[PDB]
Amino acid sequence: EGPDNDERFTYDYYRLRVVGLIVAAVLCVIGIIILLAGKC
Amino acid sequence: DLDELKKEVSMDDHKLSLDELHNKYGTDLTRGLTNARAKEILARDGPNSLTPPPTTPEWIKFCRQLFGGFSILLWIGAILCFLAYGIQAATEDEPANDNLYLGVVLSTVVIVTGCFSYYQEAKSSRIMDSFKNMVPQQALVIRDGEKSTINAEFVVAGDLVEVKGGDRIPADLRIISAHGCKVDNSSLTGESEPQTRSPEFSSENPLETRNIAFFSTNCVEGTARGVVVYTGDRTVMGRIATLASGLEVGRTPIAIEIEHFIHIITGVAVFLGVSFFILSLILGYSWLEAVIFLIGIIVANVPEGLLATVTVCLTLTAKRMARKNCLVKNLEAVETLGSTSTICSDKTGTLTQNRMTVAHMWFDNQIHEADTTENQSGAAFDKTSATWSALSRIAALCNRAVFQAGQDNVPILKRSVAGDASESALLKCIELCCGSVQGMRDRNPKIVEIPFNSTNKYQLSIHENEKSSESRYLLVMKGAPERILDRCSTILLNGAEEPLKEDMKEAFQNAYLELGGLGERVLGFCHFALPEDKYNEGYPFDADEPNFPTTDLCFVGLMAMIDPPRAAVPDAVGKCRSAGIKVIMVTGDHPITAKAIAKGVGIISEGNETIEDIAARLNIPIGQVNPRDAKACVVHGSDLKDLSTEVLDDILHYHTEIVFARTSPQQKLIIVEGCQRQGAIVAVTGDGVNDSPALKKADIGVAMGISGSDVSKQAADMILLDDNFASIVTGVEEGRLIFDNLKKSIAYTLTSNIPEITPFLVFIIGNVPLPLGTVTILCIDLGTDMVPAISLAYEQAESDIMKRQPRNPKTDKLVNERLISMAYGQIGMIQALGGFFSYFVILAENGFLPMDLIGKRVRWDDRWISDVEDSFGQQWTYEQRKIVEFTCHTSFFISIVVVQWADLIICKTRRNSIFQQGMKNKILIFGLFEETALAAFLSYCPGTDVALRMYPLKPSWWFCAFPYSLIIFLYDEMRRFIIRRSPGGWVEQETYY
Amino acid sequence: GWKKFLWDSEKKEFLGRTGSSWFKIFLFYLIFYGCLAGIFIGTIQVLLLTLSDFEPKYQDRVAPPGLSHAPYAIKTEISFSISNPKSYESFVKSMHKLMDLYNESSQAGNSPFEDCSDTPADYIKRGDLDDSQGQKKACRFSRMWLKNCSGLDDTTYGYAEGKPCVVAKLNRIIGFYPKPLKNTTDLPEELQANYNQYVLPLRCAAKREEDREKIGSIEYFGLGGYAGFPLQYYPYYGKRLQKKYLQPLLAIQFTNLTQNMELRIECKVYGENIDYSEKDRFRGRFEVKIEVKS
Ligand SMILES: *[C@@H]1O[C@H](CO[C@@H]2O[C@@H](C)[C@@H](O)[C@@H](O)[C@@H]2O)[C@@H](O[C@@H]2O[C@H](CO)[C@@H](O[C@@H]3O[C@H](CO[C@H]4O[C@H](CO)[C@@H](O)[C@H](O)[C@@H]4O)[C@@H](O)[C@H](O[C@H]4O[C@H](CO)[C@@H](O)[C@H](O)[C@@H]4O)[C@@H]3O)[C@H](O)[C@H]2NC(C)=O)[C@H](O)[C@H]1NC(C)=O
Ligand SMILES: *[C@@H]1O[C@H](CO[C@@H]2O[C@@H](C)[C@@H](O)[C@@H](O)[C@@H]2O)[C@@H](O[C@@H]2O[C@H](CO)[C@@H](O[C@@H]3O[C@H](CO)[C@@H](O)[C@H](O[C@H]4O[C@H](CO)[C@@H](O)[C@H](O)[C@@H]4O)[C@@H]3O)[C@H](O)[C@H]2NC(C)=O)[C@H](O)[C@H]1NC(C)=O
Ligand SMILES: CCCCCCCC/C=C\CCCCCCCC(=O)OC[C@H](COP(=O)(O)OCC[N+](C)(C)C)OC(=O)CCCCCCC/C=C\CCCCCCCC
Ligand SMILES: CCCCCCCC/C=C\CCCCCCCC(=O)OC[C@H](COP(=O)(O)OCC[N+](C)(C)C)OC(=O)CCCCCCC/C=C\CCCCCCCC
Ligand SMILES: CCCCCCCC/C=C\CCCCCCCC(=O)OC[C@H](COP(=O)(O)OCC[N+](C)(C)C)OC(=O)CCCCCCC/C=C\CCCCCCCC
Ligand SMILES: CCCCCCCC/C=C\CCCCCCCC(=O)OC[C@H](COP(=O)(O)OCC[N+](C)(C)C)OC(=O)CCCCCCC/C=C\CCCCCCCC
Ligand SMILES: CCCCCCCC/C=C\CCCCCCCC(=O)OC[C@H](COP(=O)(O)OCC[N+](C)(C)C)OC(=O)CCCCCCC/C=C\CCCCCCCC
Ligand SMILES: CCCCCCCC/C=C\CCCCCCCC(=O)OC[C@H](COP(=O)(O)OCC[N+](C)(C)C)OC(=O)CCCCCCC/C=C\CCCCCCCC
Ligand SMILES: CCCCCCCC/C=C\CCCCCCCC(=O)OC[C@H](COP(=O)(O)OCC[N+](C)(C)C)OC(=O)CCCCCCC/C=C\CCCCCCCC
Ligand SMILES: *[C@@H]1O[C@H](CO)[C@@H](O[C@@H]2O[C@H](CO)[C@@H](O)[C@H](O)[C@H]2NC(C)=O)[C@H](O)[C@H]1NC(C)=O
Ligand SMILES: CC(C)CCC[C@@H](C)[C@H]1CC[C@H]2[C@@H]3CC=C4C[C@@H](O)CC[C@]4(C)[C@H]3CC[C@]12C
Ligand SMILES: CC(C)CCC[C@@H](C)[C@H]1CC[C@H]2[C@@H]3CC=C4C[C@@H](O)CC[C@]4(C)[C@H]3CC[C@]12C
Numbered sequence A: 001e002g003p004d005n006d007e008r009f010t011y012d013y014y015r016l017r018v019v020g021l022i023v024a025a026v027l028c029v030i031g032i033i034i035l036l037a038g039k040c
Numbered sequence B: 001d002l003d004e005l006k007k008e009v010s011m012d013d014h015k016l017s018l019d020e021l022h023n024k025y026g027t028d029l030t031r032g033l034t035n036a037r038a039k040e041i042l043a044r045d046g047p048n049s050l051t052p053p054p055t056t057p058e059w060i061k062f063c064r065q066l067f068g069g070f071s072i073l074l075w076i077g078a079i080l081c082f083l084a085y086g087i088q089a090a091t092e093d094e095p096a097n098d099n100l101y102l103g104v105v106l107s108t109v110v111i112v113t114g115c116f117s118y119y120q121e122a123k124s125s126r127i128m129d130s131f132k133n134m135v136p137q138q139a140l141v142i143r144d145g146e147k148s149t150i151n152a153e154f155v156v157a158g159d160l161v162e163v164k165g166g167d168r169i170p171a172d173l174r175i176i177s178a179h180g181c182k183v184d185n186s187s188l189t190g191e192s193e194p195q196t197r198s199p200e201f202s203s204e205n206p207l208e209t210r211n212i213a214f215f216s217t218n219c220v221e222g223t224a225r226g227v228v229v230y231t232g233d234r235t236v237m238g239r240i241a242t243l244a245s246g247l248e249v250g251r252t253p254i255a256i257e258i259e260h261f262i263h264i265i266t267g268v269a270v271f272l273g274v275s276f277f278i279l280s281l282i283l284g285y286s287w288l289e290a291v292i293f294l295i296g297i298i299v300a301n302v303p304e305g306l307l308a309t310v311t312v313c314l315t316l317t318a319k320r321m322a323r324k325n326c327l328v329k330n331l332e333a334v335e336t337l338g339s340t341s342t343i344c345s346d347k348t349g350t351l352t353q354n355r356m357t358v359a360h361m362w363f364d365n366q367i368h369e370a371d372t373t374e375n376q377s378g379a380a381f382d383k384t385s386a387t388w389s390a391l392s393r394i395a396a397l398c399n400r401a402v403f404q405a406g407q408d409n410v411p412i413l414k415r416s417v418a419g420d421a422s423e424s425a426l427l428k429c430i431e432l433c434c435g436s437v438q439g440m441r442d443r444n445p446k447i448v449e450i451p452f453n454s455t456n457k458y459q460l461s462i463h464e465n466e467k468s469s470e471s472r473y474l475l476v477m478k479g480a481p482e483r484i485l486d487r488c489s490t491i492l493l494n495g496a497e498e499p500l501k502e503d504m505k506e507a508f509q510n511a512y513l514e515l516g517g518l519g520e521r522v523l524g525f526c527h528f529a530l531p532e533d534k535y536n537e538g539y540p541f542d543a544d545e546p547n548f549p550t551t552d553l554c555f556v557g558l559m560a561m562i563d564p565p566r567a568a569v570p571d572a573v574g575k576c577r578s579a580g581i582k583v584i585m586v587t588g589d590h591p592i593t594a595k596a597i598a599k600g601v602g603i604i605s606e607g608n609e610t611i612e613d614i615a616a617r618l619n620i621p622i623g624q625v626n627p628r629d630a631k632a633c634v635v636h637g638s639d640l641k642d643l644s645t646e647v648l649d650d651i652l653h654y655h656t657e658i659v660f661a662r663t664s665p666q667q668k669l670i671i672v673e674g675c676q677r678q679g680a681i682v683a684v685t686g687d688g689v690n691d692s693p694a695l696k697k698a699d700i701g702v703a704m705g706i707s708g709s710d711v712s713k714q715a716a717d718m719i720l721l722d723d724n725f726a727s728i729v730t731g732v733e734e735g736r737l738i739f740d741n742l743k744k745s746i747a748y749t750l751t752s753n754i755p756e757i758t759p760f761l762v763f764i765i766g767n768v769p770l771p772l773g774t775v776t777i778l779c780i781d782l783g784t785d786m787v788p789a790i791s792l793a794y795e796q797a798e799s800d801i802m803k804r805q806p807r808n809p810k811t812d813k814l815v816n817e818r819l820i821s822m823a824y825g826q827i828g829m830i831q832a833l834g835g836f837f838s839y840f841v842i843l844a845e846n847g848f849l850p851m852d853l854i855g856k857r858v859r860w861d862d863r864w865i866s867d868v869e870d871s872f873g874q875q876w877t878y879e880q881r882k883i884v885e886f887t888c889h890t891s892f893f894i895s896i897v898v899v900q901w902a903d904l905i906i907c908k909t910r911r912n913s914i915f916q917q918g919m920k921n922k923i924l925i926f927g928l929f930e931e932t933a934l935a936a937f938l939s940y941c942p943g944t945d946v947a948l949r950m951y952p953l954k955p956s957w958w959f960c961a962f963p964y965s966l967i968i969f970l971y972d973e974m975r976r977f978i979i980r981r982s983p984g985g986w987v988e989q990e991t992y993y
Numbered sequence C: 001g002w003k004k005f006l007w008d009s010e011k012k013e014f015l016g017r018t019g020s021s022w023f024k025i026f027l028f029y030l031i032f033y034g035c036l037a038g039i040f041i042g043t044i045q046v047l048l049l050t051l052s053d054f055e056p057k058y059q060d061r062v063a064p065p066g067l068s069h070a071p072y073a074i075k076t077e078i079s080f081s082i083s084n085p086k087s088y089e090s091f092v093k094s095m096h097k098l099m100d101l102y103n104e105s106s107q108a109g110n111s112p113f114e115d116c117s118d119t120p121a122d123y124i125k126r127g128d129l130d131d132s133q134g135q136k137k138a139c140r141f142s143r144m145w146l147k148n149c150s151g152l153d154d155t156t157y158g159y160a161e162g163k164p165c166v167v168a169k170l171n172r173i174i175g176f177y178p179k180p181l182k183n184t185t186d187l188p189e190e191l192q193a194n195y196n197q198y199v200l201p202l203r204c205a206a207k208r209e210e211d212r213e214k215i216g217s218i219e220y221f222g223l224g225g226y227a228g229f230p231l232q233y234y235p236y237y238g239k240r241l242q243k244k245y246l247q248p249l250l251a252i253q254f255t256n257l258t259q260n261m262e263l264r265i266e267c268k269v270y271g272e273n274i275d276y277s278e279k280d281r282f283r284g285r286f287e288v289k290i291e292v293k294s
């Protein structure tokens, strides 16, 4: 480390947003499944 | 429109003569009026047509929906928001546009709610307009000595009018000459049978005399003449309709509950505002700022989404009712049924079917019962003896009525039959269990028939015998059992014949009194085989001299008949009584029939007794017995006219099974008012016009759809398009279910108020960075929260709802202090603490420890301080610290959702446990899933920190509210436990909503 | 109603309940809220146990350092009359507040101050971010280094005759090493001359192309006479490990300023670990609206 300790000030918000969206989508799907499960 | 002169009972000029009548209105009894004179009167007073109702533009009702009680509260909230914005604009520079956004949002909410409610009431109005079928009608008037058929709108007072069986009485006539003319006074006077109209006068009451024809009445059989006495709106039913329209509406119970709810919400809102106003002035702030604080706290204490949620809640229960053919015109009339505690019903057309049907039959010294139900769902009467066959031949032959051409499609009971009511019932019973009468009649040719004389009081006729082995002649007569009994000497027992000894004569007398006491009309059928040796096949028996033996006939058996009640009438009445609803019969029919129908439907429980019944069982005068020993009472209309207010109060206060007979529509209204004077909700169920003033003044009116009148249908609040009475039970059940559900949903939407106001309060008192922003409060109150609150309506019952007593209106409210103590006091507090926890965590991880946050708002807000030292010594610019505050708003909103999970689960049930009821409500599950997906979407979607100002969260923060949620679940679970084990204890009178 | 629900004399009720009821409810709420407070406090103590006293766990919201100044401008504007003295008082008061912390009397002895190179130098590492060695030592920064803007000669600092000064400062960040641009063929025009590697350059200019002519001679004052910050005053070990620490400063005199006209001056620092933002107008650079109306 030392002078080139640039990583100590970086965060991968991109990957975090991607995962959070994948999860949100999945939860939404599951919800729909449960809602329509019975009318078919 | 003098109401008192319309509230009075009808008066008339019936007790007069034909000369006095013609001398008062002016008219030739044999030539009628002249055309010139007729037109002079037509133009002098107006056409014989009822006035149209008071129309209503669509923008007027749209403006009505835009206002009210709840929408008005939201309106004042929007006004306050814009006022605070104007202030901030004139006092400071760089005014935050927070207040303006909140104001336009509240206005949009009110507009959307109004559009939805208005659309629903319009839907019901369209399906309601598809029922008024008005085909023009023309009357037969005699002018200058000639008969002419002119539009009903051209009849005037004074001309001569002729009627014929099958036509409708145009205006109010004064019969001058009749020929066996019967009329149907069921809609106006409620008389189930056809009263004969005679030119002579008989009773002092105009509704009882026979010399007056009435508007909207139909002539069943016969022809008559008459002078038009009353025309246009001045008619009887015209004054009744005008009175109905000139009555007030009232104010439903759900509306009063919403009003008291707003009263409490405003009490606590203005209290927190004036108090934090004096407190802010005591800490140094200036007036200009304190005013904004007052407005902010008051506006913040207002549930914006509760309006749309309540509207959807009420709308959901209405579609079910519409699925079972129960349509409501308004939207709140869906709850009034559940709160009803006294149902005033009508007999003719509502409690009964208004159709004569063969009830009991006598044959083989044994009473037999026939099925008298619409869909024919009952017990047969043993069609295996020869006696029954002979009876079928007598009734099917000695009868002149025949089904109306083209009825090959309708059922055997609902088809049209041209003839008297008795002959129609007989024809229907024979066609029901004996096949096609048309072939039974062509199978035996009728040779000679002697009609019905008023002296002979018997109808006889001879026909050929279809026996291919017997060419003799058959004779059949029918009539009153006494006259027929005096003409027989044999009895057809089980087929064979026997003498008429006094044993069977007494059995016939007891049978006559048995069928008579049942409120039925009994007739006797007999026949005889004419000897072909004394009357050959060629001899013609002209109806002139005694060609047939009047006596020595063979009596076969009696045949009774009466109008039966609708299928689900007894079961529904019993269900209503089980729910603690007092059933009181109110009808303008004969008391002898009203009492029988009451005992048959459950109004007068079997065993209870009236004062006259006791006097008859003891054989003592009626003035000696005490009226307290009689549970049920039959109040006659004539006696009701002479009764004080206190007497009526006592009648309803001491008698549990009351039956008001021979009561006029005005008296019906008086009875409804007498019921309201005490304090109970009233529901009137009717069908005719006499029920219009009763359905209007009652808390809720139920009109029949098929058998109901247009006036009572337009003046009622609920319509039964299928004429089913069990729908009343379904309605009283739904009215309760949606009440307990409204309570649960209200506690849900009110619990979040605390974790949405506490941040600002600590912001002003403790001087910490703003915890909960405005676009987050908006994303909570109008976003996520909506679906769960809507789902709380689909909750099933916990205990039997059709078992508990009706809710007391003066003590058990909709929103009591027990709810406020839970939402505002215990659950909301925990949710607020959880939010502050996530807050402090976010600020502690970035460098601002809790010790350095108290006292920073002055520099944390300042826009020109680009060097704010944190707990570690770092220098933060203005935009950098603002980004952190916004991320704290995002996490606070997510914490709110996390605690709302356990709040929606503890709100699902009010007493029972979750492991008992069960999570069978799929909508609630979908609500939780969507509630979470929306929060994740609002935070992780790119461009949100620019549009809505919500930054992404780090996966370790999302878990700061979980312990608080589990704790909420545990607390409410143990709460809903002591209530069960300890009924009536502290936890119940303190936390049981 | 009004009177009864307030005080009845048959059931001896006040507001609705008797004497013993209000006590049952008050006691219940006291115990409930007490448990609530104790639980919240415990959940906050575990938090205090999760953080370190010598370093912020997350340092990403403060990666690109800001560029602030000594005068306190309400809208980033410096407007004052050369005649009325009660016009530039708000400026001098601030300036003074900032320079009042670099007084020599404060910087004295061996502890905790240390004499450093009078000419720009390289970084200096006083170990790790621990408590093993006692309070670290910070380099001394003398007032006099700033020549015409020090309040030692002309207390007003310039505002008295139409020649104001502006003391620029780099936002203090823990463990942040400033890195300057290298001598390669790609470098701004300005930066070529006087490339002392050890100095972080600061250079002001005009926002618009027109204003160039109306702005006179930007005279910068600093350590060694250069227009920048010496790398020797870094890194910053944080308040706990380096109390009594002074950050370098750079004075800027806007000599020959056109009279009676609003001038937009944008100052900017250059370097590798330095990046600007179109949203935050104080990240690396700063704007000032000077107007010496007289
Ligand atoms: C850091 O240094 C500041 C300056 O230090 C001075 O110069 C350095 C190089 C050394 O020589 C040091 O010994 C000097 O003191 C220091 O601030 C100074 O503090 C003194 C003490 O209060 C101030 O003296 C007072 O001056 C006022 C009038 O001030 C006028 O000028 C200033 C600008 O300089 C304006 O801001 C004012 O509004 C005025 O226009 C006198 O009225 C006052 O009278 C008092 O003393 C006399 C005897 O002399 C008595 O008879 C009276 O009753 C009063 O008791 C003082 O003479 C001096 O103004 C002030 N300088 C500045 C620039 O403000 C600062 O405190 C040091 N800080 C730290 C943390 O070490
Ligand atoms: C940072 O960089 C500059 C420039 O470096 C030059 O450009 C770079 C992009 C890269 O290509 C380098 O390789 C390249 O050198 C340094 O400053 C330069 O220094 C030289 C050497 O002194 C100067 O060249 C001089 O030019 C004069 C006229 O302009 C000429 O008269 C000079 O004569 C000298 O050299 C001749 C031999 O060529 C000798 O005979 C003479 O007697 C006399 O010594 C000389 O050629 C450049 O002009 C300088 N550039 C600028 C912009 O001033 C700089 O020193 C460096 N800094 C550090 C700390 O490394
Ligand atoms: C009955 C009701 C059922 C309801 C089911 C709902 C479905 C749930 C759906 C999804 C949940 C799974 C999520 C998994 C996501 C992992 C993704 C991942 O890669 O994530 C890594 C992070 C670490 O982030 P960092 O900051 O360290 O690095 C950041 C480094 N950078 C930023 C530089 C890149 O980690 C994380 O997000 C941690 C993710 C959270 C961990 C899941 C914890 C589960 C909790 C309780 C369940 C226990 C069940 C027990 C079984 C009982 C059976 C009877
Ligand atoms: C019946 C069955 C139904 C099934 C339906 C399934 C639907 C599909 C399900 C999931 C789709 C997943 C799509 C994933 C998109 C990833 C986009 C992404 O990762 O973008 C990240 C970057 C922005 O990063 P930055 O550097 O600016 O960060 C800020 C850095 N700072 C602030 C520090 C400077 O993007 C960019 O640049 C460019 C972005 C371009 C715009 C992309 C649009 C994405 C928006 C919405 C799609 C998500 C919907 C998911 C469904 C949810 C339902 C509620
Ligand atoms: C920065 C700091 C943050 C601050 C955040 C504050 C958040 C605010 C949270 C909650 C707001 C509390 C406001 C008061 C709410 C009272 C509820 C209320 O008014 O509901 C209305 C009920 C009516 O109910 P009903 O329709 O069933 O009646 C039927 C009667 N029938 C049937 C016999 C006719 O009326 C009643 O309950 C009667 C009225 C009783 C009023 C009691 C007033 C107590 C208020 C403060 C006490 C403080 C003392 C502290 C010192 C303690 C000693 C150590
Ligand atoms: C540390 C973290 C703290 C978090 C705190 C917040 C927690 C809130 C979230 C979830 C709480 C779950 C509670 C579990 C309760 C289970 C109760 C249960 O199992 O009671 C069994 C019932 C009773 O049956 P019975 O005897 O009446 O049947 C009679 C049938 N006959 C009539 C045919 C005979 O059976 C039934 O209800 C029928 C089967 C229903 C199965 C339900 C399964 C779904 C459960 C939860 C959904 C997950 C939501 C997740 C939200 C997060 C979104 C991201
Ligand atoms: C059964 C039925 C199922 C239906 C489910 C439907 C789910 C729909 C799922 C996803 C669609 C969501 C909308 C997509 C928005 C895409 C926006 C986008 O791709 O933006 C990309 C660019 C960002 O570019 P940059 O990184 O270079 O910016 C740098 C800026 N610097 C550097 C100055 C800071 O955007 C910009 O520039 C400007 C950003 C414009 C902001 C647009 C956001 C809209 C705001 C509120 C609407 C959300 C309401 C919630 C509705 C919930 C429905 C369930
Ligand atoms: C069924 C489930 C539904 C779920 C949906 C969730 C419901 C949401 C409920 C309420 C949220 C609505 C609040 C509207 C907020 C508007 C904010 C706004 O106008 O801020 C103005 C900003 C100005 O900001 P500045 O001064 O910092 O600019 C400085 C620029 N300098 C410095 C560079 C010059 O301009 C900008 O952001 C420019 C970009 C404009 C973005 C407009 C986004 C509108 C978002 C929603 C409206 C539609 C919602 C309808 C759905 C209803 C659901 C029932
Ligand atoms: C972060 C958020 C944390 C939140 C944690 C909250 C924990 C605090 C929970 C409970 C503390 C309150 C205890 C108050 C005890 C004093 C109350 C009292 O003085 O009461 C007196 C009565 C006895 O009078 P009586 O009825 O015989 O007289 C008849 C009189 N007349 C007619 C009016 C009915 O007492 C009774 O009835 C007995 C009723 C006692 C009340 C039981 C309530 C228990 C509720 C929750 C405990 C579960 C905690 C689970 C947490 C798990 C954490 C992981
Ligand atoms: C400061 O600015 C002034 C102009 O305001 C410059 O002096 C002018 O120079 C022109 C010739 O180019 C003369 O015509 C003017 O009469 C001068 N005006 C004054 C007031 O002297 C001056 O050269 C500038 N000095 C510096 C150091 O930039
Ligand atoms: C019924 C109960 C027990 C289910 C509890 C589910 C919890 C653990 C689920 C619900 C939503 C989930 C979050 C959904 C989205 C993200 C964003 C992602 O980038 C990291 C994980 C994270 C933060 C998830 C962590 C786990 C989470 C909080
Ligand atoms: C379940 C409920 C009732 C338990 C509540 C426990 C309360 C009383 C406990 C939980 C955590 C505890 C705190 C833990 C740490 C400290 C720091 C110490 O330097 C002083 C005491 C103090 C501040 C404690 C006070 C008591 C405390 C707040």
Ligand SMILES: C[C@]12CC/C(=N\OCCN)C[C@@H]1C(=O)C[C@@H]1[C@@H]2CC[C@]2(C)C(=O)CC[C@@H]12
Binding pocket: B096, B098, B099, B102, B292, B296, B297, B299, B300, B301, B302, B303, B304, B760, B772, B773, B774, B777, B781
């Ligand atoms: C009080 C509030 C408007 C009302 C509000 N919620 O209104 C939803 C009604 N249920 C909470 C808002 C806040 O907390 C933040 C408030 C804002 C008004 C304007 C305020 C007071 C400001 O100038 C700074 C904080 C702003």
Ligand SMILES: [Mg+2]
Binding pocket: B186, B190, B346, B347, B348, B349, B350, B686, B687, B688
């Ligand atoms: Mg009727």
Ligand code: NA
Binding pocket: B249, B250, B695, B696, B697, B698, B699, B700, B701, B717
């Ligand atoms: Na009504």
